[PDB]
Structures are given as structure tokens and as C-alpha cells.
Amino acid sequence: VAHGLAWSYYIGYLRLILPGLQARIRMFNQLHNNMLSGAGSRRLYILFPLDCGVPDNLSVVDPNIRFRDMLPQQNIDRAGIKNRVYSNSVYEILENGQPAGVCILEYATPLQTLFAMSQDAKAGFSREDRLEQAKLFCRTLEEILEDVPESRNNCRLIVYQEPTDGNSFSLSQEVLRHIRQ
Amino acid sequence: AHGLAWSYYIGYLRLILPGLQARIRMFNQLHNNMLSGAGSRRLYILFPLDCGVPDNLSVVDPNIRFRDMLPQQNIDRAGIKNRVYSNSVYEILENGQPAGVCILEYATPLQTLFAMSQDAKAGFSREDRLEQAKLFCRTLEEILEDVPESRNNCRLIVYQEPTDGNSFSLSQEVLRHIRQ
């Protein structure tokens, strides 16, 4: 279920990462010349492509999203793993070749799991079903996060769908728009 | 449940199994060939069917003691450059004395299944849990059936408490798997 994946993304990740995020940003700024200085820059921006096309490297889908650095790692004992490592990446977003914004950015990994699952021989299901699962994942997550008062200021969910009708969509522009709000 | 088994395979086992032996070789160069028996060179994963996943093994069975970590494995993942994958090595005691050593952890998504079972809504309602926990293990053994590519870089230790019996010994069960 998208249900289970949403509960998993909360319980196994956001729940653990959001409370410590700002301390990790303060440290990043101390080490990297106050690079994450704007208020728009102190959130985790999470990409939810409802089509579930999720590359591992962001430059594969948009040339204007450039890797810059990692936040300090977070270590937590988890399910018998001592110091399980939780990591996040800081990117610089270009506009017309100009550094236009800096933020912590990533995809919601479970959507990449739905993609792979939907295509497998036995596990598979239709694209229309995957779309509905992806939408349900976002909806179920948004429901969970209403009991998480901190989430509002530590993360931003960017949900979108790629056009297929000849209309242009720039992922970089969209991320910039959120950073700037 | 099904979803969870596929996630665990797709986002974890599929990625870490093919690099496990290289990290074990490196572990052995670093730590005096500690993972010496063939029994010691597998990822042992614990699946308690009641979904009770403590974060500290020594606390549930004092005969299981943390020793060191495998070398880390870094992978670019969904926008995270160099996401870190991590595993821990434990020694297991018998009659007070070291009796075995292996790579050991719990199946983390059982912790998610449990956390779901209470916070209710959602469905909660065990059946919801024991049911889904069995489906999870079933589905995973089914996925790994196939995949002989590497089944034997890992071993699933699926267990529950005996319904009319005595307390199940985690350490003894772990040793039994290593020894086979």
C-alpha cells in the first residue's frame, strides 16, 4: 500500500530527522560560510513526482540543480544497527546560469520504490494504479503530518506531475518558487 | 505488508547484498579475520512476528553484544549524494563465553507495522499486525526465492513466542542459524 509506504516514510524517517534538522543547518552554516542563510533555505525540500520517475542524480532531469555539499550526518541507533546514518544534500538552483537559490533537496524515495514495483513481473500493477498509489501516498503523509506541529517549518512537500501535452515545466523554477515564498 | 516487503527488497536488500562480501573481506582485513567461518559471512535479519523491534539487541538478550561495524557503503540515492548504508557485527555468548559472531539486525519495517497498529486510525486492528507480519516474511522469502544471485549473503530468522511454551531464546536461535 501507499498507506504503508507513507507510514514508513514518516515513522522511519521524517519522525527521526525533522527534530534535529535546524541544529544540523546551524552547523552547516558555521562550516560553510553561512551559505544556508535565507529563511527559505532552512527547510528540507522534498520532491514528489507523481509519475514516480525518480533518478538518483538530480542533474539527470534538470541541468539547473547543482550539488553543493552535505549537511553534517546524523547518527542514531536503529533496530540493532549502531549509528545508522541519516544524510541530506544541499543543492544550488540556477536561473539563467546564475546562482539563484540554495536549499536542502531530495526526492521522496518511496515513489521510486512504487515505480520499480509497478513494473516487476509478479508484483506489478498498472500505471493508472501507480498514479493513484502515488497520490494516496502524498495524501496519507499529509494526514500524518497534521499531528507533527514542527513539520510545517522544517520541510516542504513539492508535489507535481510532468506535462505530456507540449506545455513546459521547469523543476528548477518550481523549487525556486518555493524557496522564495 | 506486500508493499513493505517490496520496499525492503527494492530499497535495501537489492542494493546492499551484492556489495556485502567485499565489505566483509574489508572487515576481516581490519579486525583480525573476525568473520572467519562461512556461517559468519552472511547478513542475519531478525523478524519477530509480534513486530517488537527494540533498537538495542544487548538490552533484550544480554548474550548478544555489539562488537564493531562493517565498513560503510555509500550510494547516490534519490537525490541524496552518498547515502550511507550501515551494518553492525555482534558476538553471541553461550554459558557466559563467546560462542559465535555475525552480522545481525532487525527487519526495521516490522517497527513500522507496530507503530501503525496503535496510532489508530489507521487500521490498527490486529489481526492487522500478526497477519501482515507473516505476509511480510512470506513475501520476502518469495522475492529472494529467485535472486539466488545472492540469497546466501543473507538469512531470514523468522520467529515468534511458542503459544504454550517457554520464552524463546534469541541468542540460541541466532547461534543455531550461524551453526547450520
Ligand SMILES: Nc1nc2c(ncn2[C@@H]2O[C@H]3COP(=O)(O)O[C@@H]4[C@@H](O)[C@H](n5cnc6c(N)ncnc65)O[C@H]4COP(=O)(O)O[C@@H]3[C@H]2O)c(=O)[nH]1
Ligand atoms: N540496516 C539498514 N537498513 C536500511 C538502510 N536503509 C534502508 N534500510 C531498510 O530499508 C528501508 C527502506 O528503504 P527506503 O530507502 O526505501 O526507505 C525509506 C526512505 O525513503 C526513508 N529513509 C530512511 N533512512 C533514510 C536516509 N538515511 N536517508 C534518506 N531517506 C531515508 O525512509 C525510509 C524508511 O526507512 P526504514 O523504515 O528505515 O525502512 C527500511 C529499512 O529497514 C540502512 O541504511 N541500513
